[PDB]
């Protein structure tokens, strides 16, 4: 085991499968490397996930009191959240359904040795 | 009439003894 800090972001207005597509870029990396990768990656879902990673780092800053530079994003994933249902009217009186999906991004970072 | 002849004749095998459904 290694000392760990957690951060959760729930009900983020981003599809889970669109959050995972940038989560898969940064899994198992140092926090600073992950933050850089997210900051230059051209998909909008980076904005939530990046924040979540940073939030976790701060917890290890301020609640475990451990070294900034040893942090690695050990576990990160995106669960589905509640879906809102809407209607788009279509041709000849049809009415199709629209899903406004959300996500829960969870990150656990560990202070591994160098 | 190849299909009919060739189906109808496989009744004359040893294991069928000169008989078979649908002749």
């Amino acid at each position: 085991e290694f000392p760990s800090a957690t951060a959760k972001a729930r009900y983020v207005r981003v599809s889970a499968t669109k959050a995972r597509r940038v989560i898969d870029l940064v899994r198992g990396k140092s926090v600073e490397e992950a933050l850089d990768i997210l900051r230059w990656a051209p998909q909008a879902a980076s904005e939530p996930v990046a924040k979540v990673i940073a939030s976790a780092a701060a917890n290890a800053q301020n609640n475990e009191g451990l070294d900034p530079s040893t942090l690695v994003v050990a576990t990160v994933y995106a669960d589905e959240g509640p879906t809102a249902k809407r209607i788009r009217p279509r041709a000849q009186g049809r009415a199709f359904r629209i899903r406004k999906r959300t996500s829960h991004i969870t990150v656990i970072v560990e202070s591994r040795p160098p | 009439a190849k299909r009919g002849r060739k189906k109808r004749d496989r009744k004359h095998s040893k294991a069928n003894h000169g008989k078979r459904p649908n002749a």
């Binding site: 597509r21 898969d24 870029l25 990768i37 | -």
Partner: protein, 54 residues
């Protein structure tokens, strides 16, 4: 046309797999005496201060 059968999990996950992103390749630059990482495309523009390193 219309899908004849519901498609199986193996075959669904086979081409959901191709929908991925690639991480940009970063290089190091020195701005205001401290080191930052930027794409090699934006290297010059960082070296003369036209990209906002937060």
């Amino acid at each position: 046309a219309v899908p004849k059968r519901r498609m199986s999990r193996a075959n669904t996950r086979s081409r959901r797999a191709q929908w991925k992103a690639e991480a940009p390749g970063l290089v190091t630059v020195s701005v205001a005496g401290q080191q930052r990482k930027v794409p090699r495309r934006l290297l010059k523009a960082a070296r003369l201060g036209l990209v906002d390193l937060d």
